[PDB]
Write a protein that binds this DNA or RNA. Structure first.
Lengths: 166, 362, 164, 121
RNA sequence: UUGACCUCAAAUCAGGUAGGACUACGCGCUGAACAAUAAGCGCAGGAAAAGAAAAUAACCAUGAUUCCCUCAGUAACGGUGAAGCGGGAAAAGCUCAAAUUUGAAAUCUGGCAACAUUUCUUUUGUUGUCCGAGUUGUAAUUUCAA
RNA sequence: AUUGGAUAUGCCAUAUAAAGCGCUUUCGAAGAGUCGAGUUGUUUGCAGCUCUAAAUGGGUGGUCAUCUAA
RNA sequence: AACCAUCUAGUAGCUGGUUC
RNA sequence: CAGAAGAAUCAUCGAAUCUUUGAACGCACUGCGCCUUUGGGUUCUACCAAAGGCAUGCCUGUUUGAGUGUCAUU
């Protein structure tokens, strides 16, 4: 397959090929809008493993945020507000420079029939997933609030529990 | 400025903008349907150029002709796309399923009654007759020419069977035939069979659209006339007879002074326009015979002595027979127009042709 | 600007004559259309519905994952890479993978032209794996032409940073 | 007071012809009552307002029923001839697409469904 | 040139969808004073969140999450203050990315036409056909327990 | 009256199919501006900034055990 | 500068009161 | 009080109706409009009245046209 080569090339982010493409595309993305639609993901390997399928109902959006809260968390929220009818699936890092960090956000149309008839993404149609990025339910949102398993990661200790027979 | 005479008339660009149709499409819609320019009384006030009533533009907004034209154009682009991509099967299959159109709604709207269509069929009959002899060209359609010729033949057969023809005049341009159908008077001009050439000066697209509308009106009129008279619409046509230039003999009128020359067996040689002579004789109830060179399927032959009058424009008759004295087409045309048989001796071969009086001239 | 050698190599494409001859062979091995496939299958359906064994099909191979797997298996005789893939890193390794596997490869123009062979809008790479015995000499002549007009040519140019 | 039973077996044009005759009659009684109206006038108004309402109902009932029949077996119909329920119910997954499963899951429930069993004590 | 592809736009074009309100409980962000404190802002549901171990342990080992009891006012820290084990309530497991279907994109939306179906003339589908999506990858298959 | 899961039974069933178990002279892909390092702030976690990986590797524990993140 | 709502039952060694 | 004699200032409730605003949506916020259709009328080309519509962001598709595009193009 070609996603093995694409994903091992994405680890050498400052190599000659990757550095030239980082600087060429960073200039191109700056001429576009702050949030602009992407015809296809700039990282087809990374979007594919984050839940993206090349089918109707899946949308890729690019957004630049200023460097200097989590940068990826704000990209998910800003795009979610821009496309209020879509559900933010996931997001990832595509490019950066001295000023901006560029992210691509995967959104899913909960009203398209190709989404509502697909059991593997049928879950995002339910109302409990309205604005997942707004409640810290995405991948970076969950990581932001320290959700995980282990010792590395209140109300039930500030209350007096008085039983009936005590 | 925004009201009154200015709103009364709509400019050609304004009417096209309201209908969202191109100039060629608007012209085709105007020709197919009923729309004519209407010059307002106050041209300066009407402009706040060609002027049209807003009622016609309002009606044409919902006309399906524009939608059908877009579908044909859209399908044509898709057919071109398939040819360029190299998939010939897709283009060939899409050719069969290409869009079409129907003029039944337009004909009913333009002519609510058959009387109005019959009264307005004089131009349609003339256009069909003119296009029945024109050579096939790229601009014209071979199938359309065949359909126009078949429609003209069916109309001639129906007129001959019903004896609706009243006057026949021989003009320089062609043969002018006047007939009365359902009270209405229809005049048609049949051009002579000559080696003409395309003037290359008139618009072929407009003429083709007018011919297509005329053919549709003629076909609807023929079907109504056949149903009223009991004839089968369309009449049966013999392929072998058509390939033999039998003329109206191929079109069988199968059932589903009208006797001026009834007691006469006219015969025509290969020197006169027997296409119009046979129709006139058939419309008069008589029997018309033609030479084998002119066509096949002739009921009579040259050697047959049963022919009372032999039509021949040639000045010499080496094989002249007895009882078949030569006559000229002018006498037949004069007899048909006047309703009384003319003098065969006066219009005999080698004699001065009497002047032809126009029946339409009063 | 200055471009790396792995991206600079895509500006040196196959010449017009060799590319035109390449697509003459490719157009003999187009995959059957969705309509032609349905016609063939329904024809066999009637032979089953009423009452009643073939040869292996022949077509050009397409798809990026499919073609890369064929090169790694050394099943591809000729690999034709589009010159204008929108993310260039999709095919930026293909010339190197084809060099490592000994696969005759060429960079042709207009990824749209590649897609037209396979009845698609767009193809990133086409690969001819194995053709009929009639076209063995035609493919062999093309592979020799690609060797001279693409591999023998350039080559020293593909190791240099382009642009600037 | 006219009954709805015999107000539903006539055509709309004559049914609408009963609208205005009741309309001026109601309007006339208001003219009488402002110049002196008895208790019957108050009731005659009260009877005729409900009487106007009764015939207005059968005009609107039949007009909608005509629209429902016309838009039968059509994919898209006007918003008026549609379910209301609640906004969230109209957005929920239909029972058909809630029951969709992958072919992997179909093979699970076909060969290994939850069996019905019991334990002997 | 025709013509494909990529763009960039347009349409009172077709079908959709978001806003506002409530906010006891819930999940984020932010924040003083006398502490995830009130407030402030953002977002849900009938529950939410969490969730099938990059988890504990040092045993004869345990086995997603959540809640209760206990551990325990203990370790640790500098008065704050857990957790493992243990006892209960409830229990259910799974889905992708990374493999060539390559002897056949096997996948999907929509238009149209019929046929059904209904909490329902209001709902939800089926079959056929055409168009589009899709090879820059849609199905089947696989998820480490393999 | 509207419904749910079963039972019984008629019809239909695209099974040339699809599974579990068993056996191997054949194979077995595992998520990166992340992990991690330095440093600066918020309340160890989190966040910014600079740098930036590996492949029996990596994480967390007591050579060993356990787990398999992004 | 003013006004309003909440934190608040904020802070009291001190003042007054504290029931047959 | 009054009022009707399937009555009721009744209950149930699956059908209809539901004025102006308000997330409030043609522009405005009183008014001023746009397009289309329909009709008036004794004032019929037009005018007038009414009705139907006319917010924004975004998703899927449809149609149309541009390009400084890639080619194709003997």
């Amino acid at each position: 397959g070609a996603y093995k080569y694409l994903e091992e090339l994405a680890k050498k982010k400052q190599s000659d090929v990757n550095l030239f493409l980082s600087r060429v595309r960073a200039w191109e993305y700056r001429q576009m809008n702050v949030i602009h639609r992407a015809s296809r993901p700039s990282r087809p390997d990374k979007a594919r493993r984050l839940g993206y399928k090349a089918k109707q109902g899946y949308v890729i959006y690019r957004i630049r945020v200023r460097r200097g809260r989590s940068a990826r968390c704000t990209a998910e929220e800003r795009v979610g507000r821009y496309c209020s009818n879509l559900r933010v699936l996931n997001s990832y890092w595509v490019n950066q420079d001295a000023t901006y960090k560029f992210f691509e956000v995967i959104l899913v149309d909960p009203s398209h029939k190709a989404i509502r008839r697909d059991p593997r993404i049928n879950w995002i149609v339910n109302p409990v997933h309205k604005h997942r990025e707004s409640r810290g339910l995405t991948s970076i949102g969950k990581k932001s609030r320290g959700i995980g398993k282990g010792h590395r990661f209140w109300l039930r200790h500030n209350t007096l529990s008085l039983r009936r027979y005590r | 400025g925004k009201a009154g005479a200015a709103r009364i008339y709509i400019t050609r660009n304004q009417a096209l903008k309201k209908l969202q149709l191109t100039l060629a499409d608007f012209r085709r819609i105007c020709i197919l349907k009923g729309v004519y320019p209407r010059e307002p009384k106050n041209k300066k006030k009407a402009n706040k150029v060609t002027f049209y009533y807003t009622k016609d533009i309002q009606y044409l907004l919902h006309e399906p002709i524009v939608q059908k034209f877009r579908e044909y154009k859209v399908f044509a682009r898709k057919l071109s796309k398939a040819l360029g991509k190299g998939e010939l099967e897709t283009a060939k299959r899409l050719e069969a399923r290409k869009p079409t159109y129907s003029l039944d709604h337009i004909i009913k709207e333009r002519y609510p009654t058959f009387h109005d269509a019959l009264k307005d069929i004089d131009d349609a009959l003339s256009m069909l007759f003119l296009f029945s002899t024109m050579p096939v060209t790229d601009k014209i359609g071979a199938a359309t020419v065949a359909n126009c010729e078949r429609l003209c033949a069916e109309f001639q057969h129906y007129v001959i069977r019903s004896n609706s023809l009243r006057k026949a005049f021989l003009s320089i341009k062609g043969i002018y035939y006047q007939a009365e159908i359902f009270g209405e008077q229809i005049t048609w001009i049949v051009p002579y069979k000559f080696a003409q050439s395309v003037p290359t000066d008139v618009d072929f697209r407009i003429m083709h659209t007018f011919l297509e509308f005329y053919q549709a009106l003629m076909g609807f009129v023929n079907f109504k006339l056949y149903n009223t008279l009991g004839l089968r619409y369309p009449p049966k046509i013999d392929v072998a007879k058509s390939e033999s230039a039998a003329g109206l003999a191929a079109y069988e009128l199968e059932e589903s002074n009208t006797s001026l020359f009834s007691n006469f067996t006219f015969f025509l040689s290969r020197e006169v326009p027997r296409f119009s002579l046979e129709f006139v004789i058939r419309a008069f109830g008589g029997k018309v015979g033609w030479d084998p060179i002119l066509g096949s399927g002739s009921p009579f032959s040259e050697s047959d002595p049963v022919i009372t009058h032999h039509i021949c424009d040639r000045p010499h008759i080496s094989q002249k027979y007895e009882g078949r004295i030569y006559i000229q087409p002018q006498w037949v045309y004069d007899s048909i127009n006047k309703g009384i048989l003319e003098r065969t001796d006066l219009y005999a071969c080698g004699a001065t042709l009497p002047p032809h009086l126009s029946p339409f001239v009063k | 600007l200055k471009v790396p050698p792995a991206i600079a190599q895509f500006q040196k494409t196959l010449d017009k004559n060799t590319a035109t001859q390449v697509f003459k062979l490719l157009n003999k091995y187009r995959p059957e259309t969705a309509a032609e496939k349905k016609q063939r299958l329904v024809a066999e359906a009637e032979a089953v519905a009423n009452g009643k064994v073939s040869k292996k099909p022949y077509n050009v191979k397409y798809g990026l994952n499919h073609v890369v797997a064929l090169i790694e298996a050394k099943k591809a005789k000729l690999v034709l890479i589009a010159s204008d893939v929108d993310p260039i890193e999709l095919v930026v390794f293909l010339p190197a993978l084809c060099k490592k596997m000994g696969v005759p490869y060429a960079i042709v123009k207009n990824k749209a032209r590649l897609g037209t062979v396979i009845h698609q809008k767009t193809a990133a790479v086409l690969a001819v794996t194995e053709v009929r015995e009639e076209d063995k000499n035609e493919l062999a002549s093309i592979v020799s032409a690609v060797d001279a007009n693409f591999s023998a040519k350039y080559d020293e140019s593909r190791r240099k940073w382009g642009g600037g | 007071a006219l009954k709805t039973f015999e107000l539903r077996k006539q055509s709309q044009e004559n049914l609408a012809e009963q609208l205005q005759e009741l309309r001026q009659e109601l309007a006339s009684l208001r003219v009488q009552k402002i110049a002196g109206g008895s208790g019957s006038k108050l009731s005659k108004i009260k009877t005729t307002r409900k009487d106007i309402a009764r015939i207005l109902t059968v005009i609107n009932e039949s007009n909608r029923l005509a629209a429902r029949e016309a838009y039968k077996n059509k994919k898209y119909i006007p918003l008026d001839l549609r379910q209301k329920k609640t906004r969230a119910i109209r957005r929920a997954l239909t029972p058909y697409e809630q029951s969709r499963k992958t072919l992997k899951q179909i093979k699970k429930e076909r060969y290994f469904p939850l069996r019905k069993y019991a334990l002997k004590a």
